[PDB]
């Protein structure tokens, strides 16, 4: 059986395990050496109830743009981290006793529970694909639908309170995202991005020596322009502070930052003077920084990200939805708080973003092979091995989820992913009949990301316009055109 | 049209007039080159959209 | 194919009949797994022309 088949190679596996541990140690040393000087400090923050930490990818998932590492090497890093996770049953005899060998036997029974060393294959890509096709796709295919249902019922709420909880403008997008297994039509990622309307406006407060300022597209454009100009720091900081005071005046004319009038957040006014400390009409006591002149406004280097996720936040998800998201992403989930599973999910998210960056450095998706792209999509959890799609469809799927994960929101990511895991079984043998049309094929051009899409009104859905029909499409898609024709 | 233009529109139309003058001095060669570029873009664009040739 | 049997006079179980609607069978089974047998405001929101009906 597989027990004796794996026991036969158990002696030959320890050397490979230790070699992999050494590679992991070297790689983590290198990566942390880079991270400890280029990455910022994402402080730990506690949930609304202030008992457990909460995690978000915008702050904690950092991408080393400029990482001198091969994509296959990063795949090795992540896979060996998962192997370290899978090596945990070796501690059972060292905590239970000599009778703690039966857990090790159960571990050695199934090959999917095991690390890389017990596999006959050599290449990391073929090894990962074997593990997925043997164990991982099956485990995910039995969690996908029930996670989709939990997400639905998290939005719409329980016990017939949809008229109190759902929104009437995201309705058609909700239907297209969650009920496309009924129609068989493809989905547009922008309709999944429309789910963020349940949340508020995500803001970024830059902290200065006087007051916090809300970041905008204009200020960000100016800062990117100044950073691209490659000026001396005496001019760089001056231009940055000029843009900063300009934006400060702009928001002061707007009526202050958006955070002042949002439930759960707020900026305090000047402190009050109590009793005899009140000096006539001056009932307030301004801060020390009021003495500083406004021309000396300088950025402290500190930032505060505020997703304003009132319905989407991972804190309010619950004990079950987080565990099922980690099952669906093949992460550890048992016997841990939602904060620890949140951190595991954010680490997976960061890994996927770093892998996207390295692919873009290595020349995009088309430079990859077919098996490598299949394994990438399996890692992203948008493909099941019982599909056998084309290369253009795989590339379009990757582009879709890459743009969707660029927005840094796990809820919409899971909503997108779970749509590709709704498979049925027929009770009859003759039906379903053999189809007559060819397989579904697409291209990178079919994905519309460079254009905005308004939310369709309820019970008034609009057809899908191809990007090619837009004006100047041959100009906008020229990069993708050159990449595909080449 | 330049007379009724605002500042930014005036600058854009001035750039356009400079471009047209460059075409005139180049005897429409740069113009035909740009036409060839756009036609090549379109000609590369068509066969990629044939999902089922 | 299921309605053919019903026309012959054969009695079909509710769940045997649901198996011949696989896409609804799946979503119905998940609603059972969650354990919320309520319904109606979901219909009144997805199809606002049914509100009050
Ligand atoms: C038997 C006696 C044996 C004694 C053994 C002593 C020696 C053995 C071990 C030594 C202790 C070592 C230190 C340690 O273990 O720290 C653990 C733990 C974490 O320490 P930490 O690392 O400093 O945490 C920092 C941050 O929290 C870290 O943040 P995080 O993101 O990493 O994870 C945080 C997560 C912790 O993450 C985890 O630790 C994972 C735990 C699972 C793995 C095990 O949450 C917590 O912090 C837990 C705080 C507990 C209060 C929160 C509310 C709990 C509600 C419980 C359910 C509702 C109760 C009934 C309601 C009905 C009544 C109204 O500290 C504890 O508070 C332990 C409390 C354990 C008892 C909780 C029981 C709650 C229910 C009581 C009901 C009422 C009856 C009592 C009156
Ligand atoms: C056995 C397996 C052990 C491995 C750990 C269990 C699984 C991991 C886990 O539970 O996370 C720890 C849990 C974290 O929960 P979470 O994942 O962050 O979910 C929070 C979500 O926001 C919540 O999201 P959610 O809404 O989806 O989940 C809600 C869920 C959340 O509840 C839970 O977290 C349950 C978690 C399962 C715990 C397993 C317990 C199994 C017991 C058998 C060392 C401990 C030394 C001290 C021992 C004595 C306390 O249900 C509840 O809220 C109710 C919980 C309380 C049920 C029992 C109430 C009894 C009432 C009796 C009547 C009282 C009348 C007197 C009234 C007085 C006047 C006011 O934190 C702790 O409970 C303390 C951590 C360290 C000890 C954990 C184990 C013992 C305490 C439980
Ligand atoms: C405290 C907890 C703090 C950290 C929590 C994290 C954690 O513990 O992860 C466990 C972890 C759960 O899996 P995961 O971390 O979510 O990742 C799953 C993978 O993604 C793969 O996911 P998957 O879907 O492919 O599933 C893999 C499959 C296969 O999993 C395997 O790797 C092979 C099966 C190993 C079974 C080990 C349990 C043996 C139980 C004792 C049996 C009797 C022993 C002999 C007589 C004595 O899982 C299973 O069939 C069952 C796994 C759970 C077994 C129960 C583990 C007990 C943990 C102790 C805390 C909870 C009690 C409170 O268990 C393992 O999978 C590895 C074995 C862990 C050995 C830990 C040794 C320390 C045990 C302390 C005992 C405390 C007893 C207290 C009550 C009495
Ligand atoms: C009675 C009906 C059966 C009882 C089952 C209850 C299970 C208890 C449990 O697992 O706690 C973990 C569970 C939390 O664990 P978790 O971290 O969410 O992970 C779930 C398991 O890993 C999910 O399980 P799994 O997918 O990892 O499957 C493996 C598991 C499943 O296998 C088994 O546990 C039992 C095997 C026989 C049945 C197999 C049927 C197939 O076996 C194990 O190796 C670990 C179990 C030890 O604790 C609770 O949810 C709390 C419920 C129990 C407390 C409620 C109130 C109790 C009364 C309080 C009195 C004082 C109040 C004042």
């Amino acid at each position: 059986t597989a027990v004796v088949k794996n026991l036969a190679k158990l002696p030959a596996a320890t050397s490979q395990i230790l070699t992999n541990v050494s590679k992991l140690q070297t790689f983590h040393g290198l990566l942390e050496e880079r991270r400890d000087k280029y990455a910022p400090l994402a402080y730990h923050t506690y949930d609304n109830l202030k008992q457990k930490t909460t995690w978000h990818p915008i702050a904690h998932a950092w991408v080393d743009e400029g990482l001198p590492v091969s994509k296959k090497e990063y795949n090795e890093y992540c896979w060996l981290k998962k192997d370290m996770q899978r090596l945990l049953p070796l501690a059972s005899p060292f905590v239970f006793g000599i009778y703690g060998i039966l857990p090790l036997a159960v571990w050695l029974s199934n090959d999917g529970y095991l690390p890389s060393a017990f596999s006959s294959k050599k290449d990391i890509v073929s090894k990962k694909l074997e593990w997925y096709s043997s164990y991982g796709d099956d485990l995910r295919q039995q969690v996908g639908p029930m996670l989709q249902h939990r997400l639905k019922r998290h939005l719409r709420g329980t016990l017939n309170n949809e008229h109190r909880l759902m929104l009437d403008e995201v309705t058609e997008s909700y239907k297209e995202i969650f009920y496309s297994h009924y129609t068989g039509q493809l989905r547009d990622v922008r309709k999944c991005a429309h789910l963020r309307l349940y949340d508020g406006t995500s803001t970024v407060l830059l902290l200065t020596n006087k007051e916090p300022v809300e970041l905008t597209s204009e200020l960000l454009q100016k800062w990117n322009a100044i950073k691209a100009a490659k000026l001396s720091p005496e001019e760089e900081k001056k231009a940055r502070n000029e843009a900063l005071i300009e934006a400060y005046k702009e928001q002061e004319l707007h009526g202050g930052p958006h955070v002042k009038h949002m439930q759960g957040y707020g900026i305090p006014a000047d402190t009050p003077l109590l009793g005899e400390n009140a000096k006539g009409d001056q009932y307030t006591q301004p801060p020390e920084s009021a003495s500083i002149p406004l021309e000396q406004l300088e950025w402290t280097g500190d930032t505060v990200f505020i997703p304003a996720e009132y319905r989407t936040e991972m804190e309010d998800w619950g004990r079950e939805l987080t565990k099922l998201a980690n099952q669906f992403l093949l992460l550890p989930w048992r016997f841990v708080s939602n904060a620890w599973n949140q951190r595991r999910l954010v680490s997976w998210f960061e890994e996927i973003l770093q892998e996207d960056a390295l692919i873009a450095k290595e020349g995009g998706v088309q430079a990859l092979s077919d098996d490598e792209l299949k394994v990438a999509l399996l890692d992203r959890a948008v493909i099941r091995c019982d599909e056998e799609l084309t290369r253009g469809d795989m590339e379009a799927r990757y582009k879709e989820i890459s743009w969707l994960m660029s927005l840094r929101n796990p809820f919409i990511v899971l909503a997108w992913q779970t749509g590709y895991y709704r498979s049925t079984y027929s009770p009859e043998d003759d039906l379903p009949e053999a189809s007559i049309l060819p397989k579904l094929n697409r291209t990178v051009l079919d994905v519309d990301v460079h254009n905005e899409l308004a939310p369709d009104h309820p019970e008034k859905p609009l057809p899908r316009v191809h990007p090619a029909l837009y004006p100047n499409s041959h100009l906008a898609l020229a990069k993708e055109v050159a990449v595909l024709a080449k | 049209q330049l007379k009724t233009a605002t500042e930014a529109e005036r600058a854009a139309i001035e750039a356009d007039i400079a471009r047209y003058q460059e075409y005139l001095d180049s005897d429409l060669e740069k113009l035909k080159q740009d036409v060839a570029e756009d036609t090549a873009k379109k000609q590369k664009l068509i066969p990629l959209l044939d999902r089922y040739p | 194919r299921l309605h053919e049997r019903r026309l012959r006079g054969d009695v079909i179980d509710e769940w045997e009949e649901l198996d011949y609607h696989p896409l609804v069978r799946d979503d119905t089974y998940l609603a059972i797994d969650f354990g919320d047998p309520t319904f109606g405001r979901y219909i009144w929101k997805l199809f606002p022309h049914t509100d009050g009906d």
Side-chain angles (χ1 to χ4, degrees), chain A residues 330-402:
Chain A
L330 311 182
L331 300 167
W333 56 278
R334 308 181 162 83
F335 304 117
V336 295
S337 310
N338 295 337
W340 293 0
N341 285 336
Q342 268 173 64
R343 188 82 201 77
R344 289 163 171 174
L345 174 45
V346 170
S347 80
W348 170 90
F349 201 101
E350 183 173 11
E351 288 163 17
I352 295 295
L353 293 172
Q354 198 73 64
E355 205 180 352
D356 288 334
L358 295 170
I359 282 155
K361 261 166 65 169
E362 287 285 342
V365 194
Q366 290 80 2
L368 307 177
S369 77
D370 299 348
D371 280 313
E372 196 166 13
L373 176 53
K374 201 174 181 158
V375 164
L377 295 176
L378 284 167
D379 279 310
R380 272 84 181 163
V382 287
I383 196 184
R384 50 180 200 274
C385 290
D386 309 347
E387 265 170 322
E388 196 69 18
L389 309 170
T390 67
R391 189 72 179 278
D393 206 338
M394 287 160 150
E395 290 168 6
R397 209 174 280 241
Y398 182 89
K399 169 164 170 190
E400 282 172 343
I401 192 159
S402 300

Side-chain angles (χ1 to χ4, degrees), chain C residues 12-32:
Chain C
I12 304 108
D13 213 328
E14 189 173 28
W15 301 82
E16 186 186 356
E17 163 161 20
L18 196 63
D19 285 327
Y20 286 81
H21 210 158
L23 296 156
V24 166
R25 174 261 307 289
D26 301 5
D27 285 306
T28 295
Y29 279 25
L30 299 165
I32 285 155

Side-chain angles (χ1 to χ4, degrees), chain A residues 283-342:
Chain A
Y283 299 111
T284 50
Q285 172 165 317
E288 296 179 328
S289 78
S291 89
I292 285 158
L294 194 67
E295 298 199 339
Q296 294 175 356
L297 187 65
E298 296 157 27
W299 181 43
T300 310
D302 298 345
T303 310
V304 192
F305 297 82
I306 292 147
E309 283 172 6
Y310 288 101
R311 299 288 299 285
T312 291
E313 56 170 7
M314 302 176 79
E315 304 147 36
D316 198 24
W317 277 10
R319 181 81 209 159
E320 296 144 45
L321 176 51
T322 303
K323 283 194 282 160
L324 294 168
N326 286 39
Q327 280 180 65
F328 178 77
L329 302 168
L330 311 182
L331 300 167
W333 56 278
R334 308 181 162 83
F335 304 117
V336 295
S337 310
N338 295 337
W340 293 0
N341 285 336
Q342 268 173 64

Side-chain angles (χ1 to χ4, degrees), chain A residues 145-146 149-150 152-153 156 158-160 162-163 166 174-175 179 181-182 422-425 427-428 431 459, chain C residues 1 19-20 22-27 29-31 33-34 36 38-42 45-50:
Chain A
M146 193 171 66
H149 200 269
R150 291 290 307 204
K152 276 148 70 179
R153 190 63 86 166
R156 66 184 267 213
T158 51
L159 210 73
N160 207 6
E162 291 87 337
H163 64 291
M166 281 206 282
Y174 171 93
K175 284 191 285 194
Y179 293 112
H181 61 284
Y182 287 0
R422 294 299 308 267
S423 303
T424 60
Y425 55 93
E428 290 270 312
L431 304 173
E459 279 183 330
Chain C
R1 190 166 292 197
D19 285 327
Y20 286 81
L23 296 156
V24 166
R25 174 261 307 289
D26 301 5
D27 285 306
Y29 279 25
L30 299 165
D33 199 337
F34 193 87
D36 201 323
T38 70
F39 65 101
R41 293 286 194 171
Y42 196 38
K45 205 87 184 184
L46 296 183
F47 314 95
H49 85 267
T50 70

